[PDB]
């Protein structure tokens, strides 16, 4: 599997996380073991596969926040969660 | 032009082929004088259809006499019928020109 098809299943599982719990780079960062450049650059990317997310925090302001995908566009949220399992360990995450 | 990144572009792209690809029987030569995008552009994008998850097959007649043709194998993690609702927008974007009709 190529750097961009690594890139790109990277992006996907992200998104997968994001869609089932709430995250912030924090928690993403203590459950994937990505330094939080990677999980930046990784989010900043979303964009150019379709994937539009927003940074959502409580009405107060006072919370840290977490991301939600407003919308998989093109990126079919269903596949990812037929192949969490393969793309789990071809991108490598570790854990707390 | 401001419109989209250089990368979205190149996305676009790759799904822009793949929906002209399941809707009719095409190669390279038939891409070419369709989309105007040289033959390189064409290569290279089907090229990497598998950085993301799209498999493509091309295709002859047991007799291997005909030209071939290009078939989705699997859409994997793109949904096809996202394109069909967004034809037109990114044709505009990836500035898509019928060859026949410019000339």
Same mark, same amino acid.
């Given at each position: 599997?190529?750097?961009?098809?690594?890139?790109?299943?990277?992006?996907?599982?992200?998104?997968?996380?994001? &869609?089932?719990? $709430? +995250? =912030?780079?924090?928690?993403?960062?203590?459950? @994937?073991?990505? /330094?939080?450049?990677?999980?930046?650059?990784?989010?900043?990317?979303?964009?150019?596969?379709?994937?539009?997310?927003?940074?959502?925090? &409580?009405?107060? $302001? +006072? =919370?840290?926040?977490?991301?939600?995908?407003? @919308?998989?566009? /093109?990126?079919?949220?269903?596949?990812?969660?037929?192949?969490?399992?393969?793309?789990?360990?071809?991108?490598?995450?570790?854990?707390?």
């Amino acid at each position: 599997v190529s750097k961009q098809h690594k890139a790109f299943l990277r992006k996907l599982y992200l998104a997968h996380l994001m &869609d089932d719990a $709430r +995250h =912030n780079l924090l928690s993403l960062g203590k459950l @994937t073991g990505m /330094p939080r450049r990677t999980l930046q650059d990784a989010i900043a990317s979303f964009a150019d596969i379709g994937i539009e997310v927003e940074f959502v925090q &409580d009405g107060e $302001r +006072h =919370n840290a926040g977490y991301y939600r995908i407003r @919308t998989w566009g /093109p990126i079919s949220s269903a596949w990812m969660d037929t192949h969490v399992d393969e793309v789990k360990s071809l991108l490598g995450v570790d854990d707390a």
